[PDB]
Design a protein around this ligand. Structure first.
Ligand code: CL
Ligand code: CL
Ligand code: CL
Ligand code: CL
Ligand code: CL
Ligand code: MG
Length: 284
């Protein structure tokens, strides 16, 4: 019914109303830790906080707080860490989380600067010879390689725990062609980017959850996980047409508030899961 509904909703013009309905029905759990006075500067927005139940804790004694949630989808058998776009003061925390949660990939869907606005801190080194050292979390990050394609860029970064000198390779998947405003006209490059992230094995049970982060203004980390989880479901269930994107989204929203930030992203999501289920069906 995916396309049937899409068409009805699109024809009747009820996207904002359908999106609003999800906002009203979405889970509401406490974010006590996120709201503590000491963590005011660790949050980009007071309106996007991690629920206490699913928040990612840093293994620091001082303050274990970071604005990030573990989204665990049982049926799809996929975990993701959804976090806000790093802040200038939270980059060491961000990588500390990447390190501690043993993540293999970091997924980014914004450019650091869009239309003259800073969307998130420059949290990774853009130059191989200029590595970054986060002294608060005692970690070093070095750009190792960088493969730049049309719609996206994959980078190999090296994360080093200066305490132990242990090093790890993190894949940075940077989708760079997301429009300044609105959602992409076509879910083509988005889906390709997703299939590429999947191919790296970064979403594999063998690693910690992939970290997908948001960006200032209207974030889009949610689309990536929603589309990805939906496809997994269509491919795993007997009846692929039994996959309810709205229900899946509500399920994810039980782990982090606000996933899918606008009606357009919800529509774009319907779209991407549709075309994508097409590929994974016709090709795969
Ligand atoms: Cl920022
Ligand atoms: Cl939008
Ligand atoms: Cl953000
Ligand atoms: Cl989101
Ligand atoms: Cl919302
Ligand atoms: Mg150079």
């Amino acid at each position: 019914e995916m396309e049937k509904e899409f068409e009805q909703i699109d024809k009747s013009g009820s996207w904002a109303a359908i999106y609003q309905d999800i906002r009203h029905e979405a889970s509401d759990f406490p974010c006590r830790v996120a709201k503590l006075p000491k963590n005011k500067n660790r949050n980009r927005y007071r309106d996007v906080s991690p629920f206490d139940h699913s928040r990612i804790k840093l293994h620091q004694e001082d303050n274990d707080y970071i604005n990030a949630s573990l989204i665990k989808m049982e049926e799809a058998q996929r975990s993701y860490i959804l976090t806000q776009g790093p802040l200038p003061n939270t980059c060491g925390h961000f990588w500390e989380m990447v390190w501690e949660q043993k993540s293999r990939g970091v997924v980014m869907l914004n450019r650091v600067m869009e239309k003259g606005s800073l969307k998130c801190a420059q949290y990774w080194p853009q130059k191989e010879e200029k590595e970054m050292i986060f002294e608060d979390t005692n970690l070093k990050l070095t750009l190792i390689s960088e493969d730049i394609k049309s719609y996206y860029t994959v980078r190999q970064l090296e994360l080093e725990n200066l305490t132990t000198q242990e090093t790890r390779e993190i894949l940075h998947f940077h989708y760079t062609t997301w429009p300044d405003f609105g959602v992409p006209e076509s879910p083509a490059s988005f889906l390709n980017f997703l299939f590429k992230v999947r191919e790296s094995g970064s979403l594999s049970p063998e690693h910690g959850p992939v970290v997908v982060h948001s960006s200032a203004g209207i974030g889009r980390s949610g689309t990536f996980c929603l589309a990805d989880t939906c496809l997994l479901l269509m491919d795993k269930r007997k009846d692929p047409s039994s996959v309810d994107i709205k229900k899946v989204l509500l399920e994810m929203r039980k782990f982090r508030m606000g996933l899918i930030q606008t009606a357009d992203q919800l529509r774009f999501s319907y779209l991407a899961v549709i075309e994508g289920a097409k590929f994974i069906m016709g090709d795969s």
